[PDB]
Amino acid sequence: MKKELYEFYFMPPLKQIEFLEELVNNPEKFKEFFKRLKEEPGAMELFLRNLYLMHPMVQIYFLELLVENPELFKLFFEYLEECPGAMEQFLLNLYLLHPMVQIEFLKLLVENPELFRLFFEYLKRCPGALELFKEIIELLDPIIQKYLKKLLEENPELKALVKEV
Amino acid sequence: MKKELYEFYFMPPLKQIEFLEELVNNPEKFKEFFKRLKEEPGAMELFLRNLYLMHPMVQIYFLELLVENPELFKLFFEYLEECPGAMEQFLLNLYLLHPMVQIEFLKLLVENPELFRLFFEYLKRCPGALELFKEIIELLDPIIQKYLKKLLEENPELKALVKE
Amino acid sequence: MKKELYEFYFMPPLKQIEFLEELVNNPEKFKEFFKRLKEELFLRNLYLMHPMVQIYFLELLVENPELFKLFFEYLEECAMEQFLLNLYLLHPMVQIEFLKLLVENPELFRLFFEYLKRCPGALELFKEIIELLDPIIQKYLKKLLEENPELKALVKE
Amino acid sequence: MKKELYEFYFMPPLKQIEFLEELVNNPEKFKEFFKRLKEEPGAMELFLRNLYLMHPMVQIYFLELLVENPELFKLFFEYLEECPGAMEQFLLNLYLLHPMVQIEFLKLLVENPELFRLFFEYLKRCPGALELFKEIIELLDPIIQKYLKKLLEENPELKALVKE
């Protein structure tokens, strides 16, 4: 994926929405596109950057599809986990996300504790970045910290999974 | 319902305003739209979040149309009360709304005080909700507070009804 | 009148600039059409428009000086508080340029203060806006006040 | 030229990228683009503001083009060196840049440390500027400062280059 990443970024949002749906609806091309970005040096950082510089609803739609297909949230995170720098960009974007996009990613993680448990597990799997996701959550707008605290308090083990160390 | 709402979001804002004006000017389509959202899982919250992520002027014009047609502002917020978590979603948007949109929304509410009281009445009906709004009042830039002060000093009873 | 202001907003930005450019170039269009508004929503729509549209509309007032007076003439007639508030809520680049245009055209700067000095307004209102600012903007504002040593004394007065 | 600069801004964002991609390759147009801006009084400040208000990808891709062609990253900065304030406008933009664009600019400097030192040598040349960039970096978002420190662990040399 040397090029296309910019071309696909400048594809119309309705085509980006449709492309991401077909990519998620069938694991075909899903594995290819993320493997091409995985094998290419740093191209996984660009995709996340492109994905997280895209229109906000394109990012929300991808998160909703990853929840609807939990197996692909595994494969999407499995590629992000191995390649270097891809885990840091995902975290960096979390703070730089629009708070409505933040609350939707936090709402989907709470409703999917298995994906939430997968999300935190991969954070421990990546060298470091434990402090990063910590500081990103601590250094955030207060109502997000309030809302996240209330959602985690509904399931204390999910709260205990946030407490960690 | 995803096709109904998500396409409505991605459609051009001027076409959305055309639909919003058609939905408002016809009160029964307004009733139908929000009654259709109640049975569907979180369709109100989805439609709200879509409305919250839309263009600011569309949100503003939607607020104006609800002011010019008062009964629908009642229906919109009474449907919000019926839908669990909708008022929580609305107050969260007000905190995350662009400060200019917050001022226009506040000015329209103070100008039509019955809509301002009806705004609070449904917030208290929900499990919690009202407590969130009081914390949202704290976290805002000063020009919101100062411009709130100019209007609310001319009618301190509204500022009184806020603390009540 | 609502459609005119909303249609002018939702038009493509390049056409909005071309709409304002000839409207400002022809003095009758800037003088009479703005008088039809007299017969806040336009300011908000302008200040919710694309930054380039806001930048060029402010620059067009510099390119044609007499119409910047008229622009502030009608606003001062009835609205001033809305213009002062929109300044604080303006995008930082839009704000810097507006203050930079006043220093580039000092007669518009004095005219900006003069219309604000009408009634005991902006004596404290425009005072707060300067103090409630991020530091890096103030540095550029202060360094630009050095060019034109004359303007330094007028701001303190 | 003011029509030409505004035509470049309001050109479609994909068009702006294709124009900048070609302009970098051939120096003849590249030198013409900044020579015609420098012969005008203060037009370099205008084009910068235009570039600094363009789409984030347009701003990012222009920096990447200068990174892919390191000699022209010196030239584009050499042309800004001629007039004062354009450096300050470049620094003012860096603070006012979207946080992902500030990271992208710093990340390109980390991936090409020689261009980092190239850009940093220019800052000490302008009056202040090095003092202003000192203020900018210490007044950024915390995670932007945090991730910068992690980039200092990847390149501790840059810490010594900063001390100068």
Side-chain angles (χ1 to χ4, degrees):
Chain A
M1 267 296 153
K2 200 164 198 58
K3 209 169 297 181
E4 175 74 28
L5 276 172
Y6 280 77
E7 166 191 344
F8 151 72
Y9 176 85
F10 284 100
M11 280 182 175
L14 248 175
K15 195 55 186 180
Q16 290 171 314
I17 288 296
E18 181 66 22
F19 165 83
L20 286 182
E21 173 260 294
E22 302 186 357
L23 167 133
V24 169
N25 236 9
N26 294 337
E28 51 86 14
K29 208 178 304 300
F30 181 96
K31 155 165 44 59
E32 318 169 28
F33 186 56
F34 295 155
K35 197 197 311 172
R36 282 194 61 94
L37 300 159
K38 157 94 152 54
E39 300 168 357
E40 284 265 354
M44 187 66 66
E45 268 185 344
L46 265 61
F47 164 73
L48 279 193
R49 181 205 69 185
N50 297 15
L51 183 81
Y52 292 140
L53 275 187
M54 270 177 206
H55 181 76
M57 262 296 171
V58 175
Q59 320 180 4
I60 290 182
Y61 215 71
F62 191 28
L63 297 175
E64 297 171 349
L65 294 173
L66 289 181
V67 156
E68 286 267 351
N69 283 25
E71 318 92 323
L72 292 195
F73 177 74
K74 292 159 174 169
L75 285 183
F76 177 60
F77 216 158
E78 216 158 30
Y79 283 130
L80 291 176
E81 176 65 25
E82 274 210 38
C83 46
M87 190 69 257
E88 328 299 305
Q89 167 59 53
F90 192 99
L91 290 184
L92 282 171
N93 159 72
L94 178 61
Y95 175 76
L96 307 188
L97 268 184
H98 183 262
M100 278 303 302
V101 192
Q102 286 186 355
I103 196 59
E104 289 308 311
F105 178 66
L106 296 180
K107 279 186 178 211
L108 286 180
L109 278 191
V110 170
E111 277 192 338
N112 284 189
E114 54 189 31
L115 307 189
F116 183 96
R117 185 151 292 101
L118 277 157
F119 177 84
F120 271 56
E121 169 64 46
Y122 281 56
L123 283 178
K124 199 181 191 208
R125 287 168 53 168
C126 199
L130 313 179
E131 202 86 23
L132 208 61
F133 180 80
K134 182 193 305 176
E135 308 311 324
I136 295 162
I137 291 302
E138 311 312 318
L139 305 162
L140 252 184
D141 53 315
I143 67 103
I144 279 292
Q145 304 200 82
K146 168 200 277 192
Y147 221 77
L148 183 61
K149 173 190 128 57
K150 296 304 298 175
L151 297 178
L152 296 167
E153 203 51 77
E154 288 194 320
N155 183 220
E157 301 294 328
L158 227 58
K159 171 101 187 64
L161 261 292
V162 151
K163 206 176 76 68
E164 282 302 319
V165 57
Chain B
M1 210 66 167
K2 272 204 165 190
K3 168 186 55 183
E4 165 177 332
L5 295 179
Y6 288 81
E7 176 218 324
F8 159 66
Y9 178 94
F10 278 93
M11 261 197 166
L14 198 47
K15 203 67 177 63
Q16 303 168 331
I17 291 187
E18 175 88 50
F19 162 75
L20 287 184
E21 190 148 11
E22 203 86 3
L23 192 79
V24 162
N25 294 9
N26 309 132
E28 64 286 8
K29 275 253 184 294
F30 189 94
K31 298 145 45 193
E32 290 173 356
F33 188 76
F34 291 91
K35 177 57 185 178
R36 284 153 29 181
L37 299 168
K38 179 59 201 65
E39 188 182 13
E40 213 273 345
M44 198 87 62
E45 327 291 333
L46 262 55
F47 158 75
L48 287 181
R49 173 214 53 188
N50 291 15
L51 174 77
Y52 303 155
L53 270 298
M54 277 198 304
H55 189 270
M57 185 147 298
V58 181
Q59 312 163 348
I60 290 182
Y61 199 79
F62 171 77
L63 290 174
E64 284 181 3
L65 290 174
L66 288 191
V67 164
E68 319 312 319
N69 298 266
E71 58 177 359
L72 311 170
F73 173 77
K74 320 176 60 170
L75 281 170
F76 168 71
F77 249 74
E78 196 140 30
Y79 269 102
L80 286 196
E81 159 270 324
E82 178 200 21
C83 188
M87 57 312 273
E88 324 269 356
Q89 183 65 260
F90 184 83
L91 302 182
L92 283 185
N93 164 75
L94 301 179
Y95 178 85
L96 301 178
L97 252 184
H98 188 277
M100 266 301 306
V101 187
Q102 308 189 41
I103 281 174
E104 315 305 301
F105 159 77
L106 290 172
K107 291 184 302 187
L108 292 171
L109 272 198
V110 180
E111 285 168 352
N112 303 81
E114 310 223 12
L115 307 187
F116 196 104
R117 298 137 191 167
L118 184 135
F119 170 71
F120 284 166
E121 179 60 37
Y122 295 143
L123 290 180
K124 168 257 307 175
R125 305 190 73 197
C126 164
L130 187 78
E131 295 80 336
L132 268 294
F133 186 75
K134 190 170 301 181
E135 185 255 9
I136 296 166
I137 302 303
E138 326 282 300
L139 326 163
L140 262 162
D141 51 57
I143 55 94
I144 287 275
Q145 280 70 272
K146 199 269 297 183
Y147 249 47
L148 174 141
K149 182 47 64 194
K150 178 193 53 140
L151 265 302
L152 273 310
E153 202 80 76
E154 306 170 16
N155 47 17
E157 300 91 352
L158 195 62
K159 167 184 50 186
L161 263 305
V162 169
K163 196 56 62 188
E164 159 183 331
Chain C
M1 194 66 59
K2 257 191 177 183
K3 175 171 179 59
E4 298 187 19
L5 302 165
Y6 285 119
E7 168 260 6
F8 159 59
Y9 184 98
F10 285 105
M11 278 156 49
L14 183 54
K15 197 55 185 177
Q16 304 185 59
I17 274 187
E18 214 179 31
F19 169 84
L20 295 174
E21 213 291 321
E22 278 296 306
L23 175 138
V24 171
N25 259 12
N26 310 135
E28 312 93 17
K29 288 187 157 55
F30 192 89
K31 197 208 315 182
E32 272 81 338
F33 211 132
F34 281 58
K35 187 259 299 177
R36 304 210 77 100
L37 293 171
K38 218 69 173 54
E39 184 175 351
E40 303 203 359
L41 203 155
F42 158 76
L43 273 189
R44 179 194 74 188
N45 291 21
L46 163 69
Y47 291 134
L48 292 189
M49 267 158 211
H50 187 265
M52 262 302 182
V53 184
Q54 316 177 72
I55 282 181
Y56 205 50
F57 179 69
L58 292 175
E59 283 181 331
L60 284 167
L61 300 174
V62 169
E63 304 169 43
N64 303 280
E66 56 267 32
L67 303 155
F68 173 64
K69 164 200 174 185
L70 299 174
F71 156 74
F72 221 155
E73 198 121 318
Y74 315 137
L75 289 190
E76 243 285 343
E77 179 178 354
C78 54
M80 306 146 37
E81 284 109 310
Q82 167 148 357
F83 171 79
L84 291 179
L85 169 64
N86 268 311
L87 293 185
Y88 178 85
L89 289 180
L90 260 188
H91 182 268
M93 272 307 304
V94 188
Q95 220 178 50
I96 285 287
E97 288 286 326
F98 175 72
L99 285 99
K100 187 155 53 184
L101 294 177
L102 293 184
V103 181
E104 289 159 357
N105 292 29
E107 293 300 318
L108 306 185
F109 166 78
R110 287 170 179 78
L111 184 133
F112 168 76
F113 274 14
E114 162 61 44
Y115 281 92
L116 280 190
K117 281 193 295 294
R118 303 253 298 261
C119 303
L123 181 71
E124 57 164 3
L125 267 299
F126 192 78
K127 166 208 299 180
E128 303 289 343
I129 306 177
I130 299 299
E131 323 303 328
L132 314 180
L133 268 182
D134 50 304
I136 60 136
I137 275 183
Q138 303 259 273
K139 180 65 159 63
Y140 211 70
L141 300 182
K142 194 64 203 63
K143 208 70 183 302
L144 265 289
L145 259 55
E146 300 175 1
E147 273 189 347
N148 281 324
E150 47 197 336
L151 299 180
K152 166 209 57 182
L154 282 315
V155 186
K156 306 301 172 297
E157 291 180 2
Chain D
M1 200 71 173
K2 204 157 193 171
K3 199 173 224 172
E4 188 101 18
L5 275 182
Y6 274 80
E7 278 178 36
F8 174 41
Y9 187 95
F10 287 89
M11 219 165 57
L14 186 58
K15 251 281 193 54
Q16 306 181 270
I17 286 185
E18 301 194 65
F19 164 79
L20 289 176
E21 170 269 322
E22 300 171 348
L23 191 88
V24 156
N25 307 327
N26 189 33
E28 309 161 1
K29 297 183 187 180
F30 173 74
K31 65 195 60 171
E32 279 172 337
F33 186 54
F34 292 92
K35 160 180 56 181
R36 290 154 61 103
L37 287 171
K38 267 303 300 171
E39 66 176 22
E40 299 207 337
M44 186 71 72
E45 312 263 4
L46 211 69
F47 153 74
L48 285 190
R49 176 205 74 190
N50 289 30
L51 174 73
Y52 300 153
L53 287 189
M54 285 171 189
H55 192 265
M57 281 270 181
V58 179
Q59 308 172 356
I60 289 178
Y61 195 73
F62 182 55
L63 304 179
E64 290 188 358
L65 289 170
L66 300 170
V67 168
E68 297 145 15
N69 300 272
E71 322 89 347
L72 305 159
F73 182 66
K74 179 71 168 300
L75 294 187
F76 153 78
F77 214 2
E78 175 92 347
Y79 308 143
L80 304 189
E81 173 69 37
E82 306 186 353
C83 57
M87 294 265 299
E88 300 150 17
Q89 179 52 238
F90 177 57
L91 301 180
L92 278 191
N93 163 70
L94 285 174
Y95 192 108
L96 296 183
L97 268 181
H98 185 270
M100 267 305 304
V101 195
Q102 318 189 29
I103 292 298
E104 273 291 320
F105 177 70
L106 285 169
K107 197 175 307 306
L108 290 173
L109 299 179
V110 168
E111 300 168 19
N112 293 74
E114 48 273 36
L115 300 187
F116 176 94
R117 173 160 30 101
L118 186 150
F119 147 75
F120 255 65
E121 172 81 349
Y122 270 106
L123 292 196
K124 291 173 292 297
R125 287 154 56 110
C126 169
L130 76 119
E131 293 123 70
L132 275 327
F133 199 58
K134 158 192 299 181
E135 166 177 339
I136 290 175
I137 58 183
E138 309 301 316
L139 292 180
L140 288 190
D141 314 71
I143 297 167
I144 307 305
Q145 303 173 355
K146 287 277 191 167
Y147 203 77
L148 174 57
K149 173 195 169 62
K150 173 148 53 180
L151 267 43
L152 260 306
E153 303 201 16
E154 186 171 355
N155 272 75
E157 293 191 358
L158 278 51
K159 173 179 288 186
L161 317 181
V162 157
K163 300 159 189 170
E164 287 280 70

